[PDB]
């Protein structure tokens, strides 16, 4: 029915997210209906897991008339960073909340800095508190400092909304002040795109378990995670080793002889001119020339606490784990930033990783790092290197 998109408030601490959030629910209950929550049924947010991770979010939804929005609100810094590397739904957009009265601070950039690595697309800004700011040139001026610090992090700073506000006024009544929410909820429909469709984007299927009908061929199973598979088309075997290439002779659902296989449905391909012997773990079908394999990568990574069934020692530069891309581990190689030694379980690093195997690896692709079979932390790949 109608789109589903997924936000939430980003920047620094006491800039009114959480204030925002519920003048959000607020004003758009009060104008086209839905459920208004208060400012402190999202203040003290639950705790949230993400397979062992802790992250204090609150999830509160809301209704414009054409969109149904899911959106995230944290108390921390420390969960907003958790919460982009490793949180339950990828932002489709964010809503940036900045104090015209403090303007960018530290948590600013770096919500900027993590939203750019960990591919959320687009960027709304709520300049806030401007019930507090007499002179306009001093808006004007952190408008302008908002703009240039994401056009420094690639975001089209010249051509983000910024509206103007005031979210704790906005809450208290004054219709105002509650014109600008409405203007805010105006820009999340028209300027965050309706996020691209699984079925939509170029085929993708990752193998998990070969067979081989006899007669028949090498059949491939697996979810498909993106597009379509159509009987007769070509697809690339890539992954571990030299990129394949073989046709499709078939598609298969529990025996039922299908033409095609659609994003999200589990599914055999065969493959005629290939054998079982040529078909590896962590390998991939994908409509040739959409997605290459890589072994170097930049990454944003989150280091599981001891708390959270995570090591309770820092690892150091030879640090060598097991990277969990869809189907299985793959040891990498790290190399830290200069002038780090160790990282501390409970940290967050930009950390460059080399695979001893290629991998079929796009940015903003999610990993897990496991030492053995356990999990000691999550990333995201920021930047393919080759
Ligand atoms: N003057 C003013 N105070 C505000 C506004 N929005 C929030 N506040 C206050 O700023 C403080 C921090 O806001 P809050 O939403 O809890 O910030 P957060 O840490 O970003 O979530 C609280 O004391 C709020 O009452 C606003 O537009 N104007
Ligand atoms: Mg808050
Ligand atoms: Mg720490």
Redesign the pocket.
Known sequence: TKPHVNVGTI?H????????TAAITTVLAKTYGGAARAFDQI?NAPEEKARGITINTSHVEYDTPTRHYAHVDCPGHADYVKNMITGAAQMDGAIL?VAATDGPMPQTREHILLGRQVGVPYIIVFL?????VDDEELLELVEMEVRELLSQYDFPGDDTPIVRG????ALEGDAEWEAKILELAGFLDSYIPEPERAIDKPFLLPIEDVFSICGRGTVVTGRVERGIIKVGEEVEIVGIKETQKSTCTGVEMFRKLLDEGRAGENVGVLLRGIKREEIERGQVLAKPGTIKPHTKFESEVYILSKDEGGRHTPFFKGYRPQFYFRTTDVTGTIELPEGVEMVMPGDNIKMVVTLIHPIAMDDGLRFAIREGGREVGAGVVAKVLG
């Open positions: 920047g601490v006491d800039h009114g997210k959480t204030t925002l203040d909340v806030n508190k401007c019930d507090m005031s979210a704790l006024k």
